[PDB]
Amino acid sequence: KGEELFTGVVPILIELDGHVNGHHFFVRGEGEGDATIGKLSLKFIATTGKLPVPWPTLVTTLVQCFSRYPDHMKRHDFFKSAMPEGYVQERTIYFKDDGTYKTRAEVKFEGDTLVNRIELKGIDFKEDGNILGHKLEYNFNSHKVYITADKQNNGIKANFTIRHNVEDGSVQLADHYQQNTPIGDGPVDLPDDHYLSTQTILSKDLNEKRDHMVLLEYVTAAGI
Ligand SMILES: [Cu+2]
Ligand SMILES: [Cu+2]
Ligand SMILES: [Cu+2]
């Protein structure tokens, strides 16, 4: 339909096919999104066993169409306007003093479900660094995701730096560079500069034996 697709609660499917250094892994997440209040509630399983990288490094890669855009900002919501046909979301992520992730995702409706299917490639990580050495805390900070229009590509770009808490009290920074392109050829909303304000909780399911991550997230657009 349109932004009409997000007036209620929407089921979500997320699938990540990952290769970091020499390691293969697969993640599938399921749950629900409520864009009217900007809320995600999701559970992710590593189907391939224990992950070679920390769960928090995957959070940004694992549906910004569920951001809450306040009424006065609805003209600037690229993500919903591309639906149902969806958009391609690509990122290049530089972990400071540490390797890089390259991601490509398609985010679109498949029936009544919003699906995010991702390919992730990671290279040049240090064996004893914060990522391959699993030295990141199981939690997640608040960020501002700065969004700009990319009118030459009929889409948007985003810039932000993720701050991962490290177990010794230091911070591991991850510079994100993001490009989104609509899949369909219908017109989309090309926004004035603004940002998304994020908050996230990472937790566990006591009955789940598999390596997993429960996620609760709230995101609201601001800056206009
Ligand atoms: Cu209708
Ligand atoms: Cu292999
Ligand atoms: Cu593989």
Distance CA 104, CA 89 (A): 6
C-alpha 82 to ligand 2 mean position (Å): 35
Residues 6+ apart with CB under 8 A from 206: none
The ligand placed nearest to the CA atom of residue 22 is 2
The ligand placed nearest to the CA atom of residue 5 is 1
Distance CA 23, CA 122 (A): 9
Please check whether residue 217 is in contact with residue 32, taking contact to mean a CB–CB distance below 8 angstroms: no
The structure was resolved to a resolution in Å of 1.8
**How many residues does the structure list for the chain?**
224
Whose tokens are 């996620």? That residue is 215
C-alpha 166 to ligand 1 mean position (Å): 48
Domain ranges of the chain: 1-224
Q: Where are the alpha helices (DSSP H) in 63-218?
A: 78-81
Please check whether residue 29 is in contact with residue 59, taking contact to mean a CB–CB distance below 8 angstroms: no
The torsion angles phi and psi of 90, rounded to 5 degrees, stand at -115, 145
C-alpha 8 to ligand 1 mean position (Å): 15
C-alpha 21 to ligand 2 mean position (Å): 9
Method: X-ray
SS (H, E, C) 160-204: EEEEEEECCCCEEEEEEEEEEEECCCCCCCCCCCEEEEEEEEEEC
Distance CA 213, CA 196 (A): 23
Whose tokens are 């304000």? That residue is 197
Question: Per CATH, the architecture of 1-224 is what?
Answer: Beta Barrel (2.40)
